[PDB]
Amino acid sequence: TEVVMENVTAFWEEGGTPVLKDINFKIERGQLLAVAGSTGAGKTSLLMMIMGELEPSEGKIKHSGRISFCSQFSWIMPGTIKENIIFGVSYDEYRYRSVIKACQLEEDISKFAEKDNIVLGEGGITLSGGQRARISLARAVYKDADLYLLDSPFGYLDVLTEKEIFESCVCKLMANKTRILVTSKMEHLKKADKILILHEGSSYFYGTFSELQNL
Numbered sequence: 001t002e003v004v005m006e007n008v009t010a011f012w013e014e015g016g017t018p019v020l021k022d023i024n025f026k027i028e029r030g031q032l033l034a035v036a037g038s039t040g041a042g043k044t045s046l047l048m049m050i051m052g053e054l055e056p057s058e059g060k061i062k063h064s065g066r067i068s069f070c071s072q073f074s075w076i077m078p079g080t081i082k083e084n085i086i087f088g089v090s091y092d093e094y095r096y097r098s099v100i101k102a103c104q105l106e107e108d109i110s111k112f113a114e115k116d117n118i119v120l121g122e123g124g125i126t127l128s129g130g131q132r133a134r135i136s137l138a139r140a141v142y143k144d145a146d147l148y149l150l151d152s153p154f155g156y157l158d159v160l161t162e163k164e165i166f167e168s169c170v171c172k173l174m175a176n177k178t179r180i181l182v183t184s185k186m187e188h189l190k191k192a193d194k195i196l197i198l199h200e201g202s203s204y205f206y207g208t209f210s211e212l213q214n215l
């Protein structure tokens with residue numbers, strides 16, 4: 001067992017309304033959990049609890065080891081595209097190239113004369129939203145970790161590109177890794193080992209895509 005929430009309730013403000021209410025799930029090592037729900041349902045807050053930024057008022061949580069987190073808000077720091085993806089982690093060509101490919105960034109990088117040394121975040125190149133999202137995803141996926149928290153990482157991508165990168169990066173490249181992906185898309189829920197749909201803090205549904213189809 002890699003991540004567990006048991007009867008978890010939590011509050012961002014003392015005596016407010018709970019941001020998560022009696023949440024339950026388990027992820028085995030190497031599995032994919034899809035977390036879905038409308039805006040404000042508590043999805044990012046659930047990731048924050050796993051990262052220790054939010055403590056439960058009721059219930060138990062299990063998770064061990066290092067986390068790589070991909071924010072739903074993409075970001076770039078001043079430096080090359082290679083520096084932004086590596087982001088202080090030791091460099092390996094094969095690992096770097098495999099992440100770039102899985103995130104469809106090889107196409108973008110090949111078009112620049114400076115290739116992977118193109119400078120970002122310093123007033124020169126202004127990236128598209130989708131480029132910034134794929135760079136942010138690549139940064140999180142390059143980091144070696146026991147648990148990957150990917151919070152709606154496909155911002156600004158058209159539905160086919162999102163599908164292709166979900167398959168190449170989240171399903172294939174990351175096949176052996178424990179993953180929590182905040183996402184609403186049907187194919188992602190169908191491919192996940194477990195799905196958790198949140199609504200206003202509560203568990204709207206928890207189970208498999210097949211179980212939901214059975215209903």
Ligand SMILES: Nc1ccn([C@H]2C[C@H](O)[C@@H](COP(=O)(O)OP(=O)(O)OP(=O)(O)O)O2)c(=O)n1
Nearest residue numbers: 012013019038039040041042043044045046072
């Ligand atoms: N430091 C914080 C963070 C969030 N909230 C509130 C805001 C929401 O009403 C509720 C859930 O916030 P989330 O960020 O967890 O919501 P989602 O991630 O599910 O929404 P979205 O899809 O818009 O990202 O908690 C708060 O009071 N204090």
Ligand SMILES: [Mg+2]
Nearest residue numbers: 043044045072
């Ligand atoms: Mg969020």
